[PDB]
Design a protein around this ligand. Structure first.
Ligand SMILES: CC(C)CCC[C@@H](C)[C@H]1CC[C@H]2[C@@H]3CC=C4C[C@@H](O)CC[C@]4(C)[C@H]3CC[C@]12C
Ligand SMILES: CC(C)CCC[C@@H](C)[C@H]1CC[C@H]2[C@@H]3CC=C4C[C@@H](O)CC[C@]4(C)[C@H]3CC[C@]12C
Ligand SMILES: Cc1ccccc1Nc1c(-c2ccco2)nc2c(Br)cccn12
Length: 412
């Protein structure tokens, strides 16, 4: 019905819980038998991990090269600055809520430097399956290591520089742009094939998790995770973003949101910001009367670099999974998670189920068990819909900001 992706995921979740409760109470499997029961779920995890490397590399180069076209002049610069500030506040807001609420609960300088080191790997081939970690030994020295763990930060940064370089090379770099455009297109087709197998893998992933839960405390922790994500998205969409619009534009932001209601409603159903653009353009220019020039240079940019939703959904999810693993975490470790979350999303911007694919990238890069994402998919459909609604609203408000900040340019 063109919504099989949503129906299949919910059906898999519902049947996964039904299978888990029945098997747990009507059977007593051993440790080895329980592992085999989740094997279809394990195979799904390998497919998602397998497609990470071509997805992020092809998409980041494709997106960055395409972004070079949209981001031109001062008008484009206003949107880039606007999306940096709103994303920055979302990153801080997400960390404050997950650290204070503490959903799944019960050196900082080294982590920060390791973050910069990973952004500049010493070998691109090794960056696909290894990450750099440092330690303090004893008067105290520093010892690097290099351990298994795809270096998403290094690959994304290089693709950023690579994408910008080829985009500016004109015709000499067109073959590289065409090559990675087709590779990106092919990878999305491959993920669609994996998405067809997802309902079977999700069924056994969730079902196996129900067999292994000793106490219902995990369900309570999942509820706090939903509250943390919903609370952060609500505050950003209701308080922070309208406040930013109000001060810069000195107009009522709530009226501005009414014109986008058609786009906001479409954002939930489709659950993709890029696919909602045609509706977003119509609402922004017709209902909000925003100049058509701004919407052309702002909305395409916002569909790529608007990470407010990721900073409030995927970053919070990664820290929540870390807290589930009894990791004490720190300022340096949380900042590493937050940057990884935004880097993963930009590399998986148009992938079906960005939320699932992005989280698997974040967990793999950070080091948390990629199988702990099972709890995320149980409500990912619900939270991903709200995440996209905030992203579209952020871009819609961004168009009003750039118009007010670039009135003189429009006159000229
Ligand atoms: C240190 C962290 C923030 C990453 C480093 C980011 C900065 C230093 C990097 C990221 C992408 C890079 C750009 C990539 C492509 C080009 C095109 C080239 O014709 C001139 C240099 C220029 C414009 C680079 C300048 C340096 C740059 C802006
Ligand atoms: C993903 C990790 C490494 C964080 C990097 C995030 C930020 C710093 C990166 C991600 C993609 C980048 C953009 C890629 C392409 C362009 C087009 C260019 O004409 C102006 C800069 C601009 C708009 C870049 C600004 C910096 C940017 C927004
Ligand atoms: C739009 C922009 C311009 C310049 C620098 C950063 C950004 N935007 C951004 C991203 C991002 C964009 C794509 C992938 O990640 N991540 C973060 C974080 Br964490 C914290 C703050 C901002 N951020």
């Amino acid at each position: 019905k063109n919504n099989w992706v949503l129906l299949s995921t919910v059906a898999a979740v519902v049947l996964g819980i039904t299978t888990g409760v029945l098997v747990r109470e009507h059977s007593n499997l051993s440790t080895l038998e329980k592992f085999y029961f989740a094997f279809p779920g394990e195979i799904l995890m390998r497919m998602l991990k397998l497609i990470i490397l071509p997805l992020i590399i092809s998409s980041m180069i494709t997106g960055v090269a395409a972004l070079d076209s949209n981001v031109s002049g001062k008008i484009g610069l206003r949107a880039v600055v606007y999306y940096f500030c709103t994303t920055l506040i979302a990153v801080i807001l997400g960390i404050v809520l997950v650290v204070s609420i503490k959903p799944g609960v019960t050196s900082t300088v080294d982590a920060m430097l390791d973050l910069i080191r990973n952004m500049f790997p010493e070998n691109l081939v090794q960056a696909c399956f290894q990450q750099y970690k440092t330690k303090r030994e004893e008067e105290y020295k520093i010892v690097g290591m290099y351990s298994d763990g795809i270096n998403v930060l290094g690959l994304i940064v290089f693709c950023l520089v690579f994408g910008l370089v080829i985009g500016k090379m004109g015709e000499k770099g067109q073959i590289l742009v065409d090559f990675f455009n087709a590779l990106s297109d092919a990878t999305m087709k491959i993920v669609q094939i994996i998405m067809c197998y997802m309902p079977l893998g999700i069924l056994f992933l969730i079902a196996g998790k129900i067999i292994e839960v000793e106490d219902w405390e995990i369900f309570r922790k999942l509820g706090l995770y939903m509250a943390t994500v919903l609370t952060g998205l609500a505050i950003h969409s209701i308080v922070i973003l309208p406040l930013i619009y109000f001060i810069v534009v000195r107009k009522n932001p709530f009226r501005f949101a009414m014109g986008m209601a058609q786009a906001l409603l479409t954002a939930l159903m489709i659950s993709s910001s890029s696919a909602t653009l045609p509706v977003t353009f119509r609402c922004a220019e017709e209902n909000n009367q925003v100049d058509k020039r701004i919407t052309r240079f702002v909305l395409p940019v916002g569909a790529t670099i608007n990470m407010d939703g990721t900073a409030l959904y995927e970053a919070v999810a990664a820290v929540f999974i870390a807290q589930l693993n009894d990791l004490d975490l720190g300022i340096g470790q949380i900042i590493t998670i937050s940057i990884t979350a935004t880097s993963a999303s930009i590399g998986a911007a148009g992938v079906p189920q960005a939320g699932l694919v992005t989280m698997v990238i974040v967990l793999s890069a950070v080091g948390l068990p990629a199988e702990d994402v099972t709890l995320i998919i149980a409500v990912d459909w619900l939270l991903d819909r709200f995440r996209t609604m905030v992203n579209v609203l952020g871009d819609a408000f961004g168009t009003g900001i750039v118009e007010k900040l670039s009135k003189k340019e429009l006159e000229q």
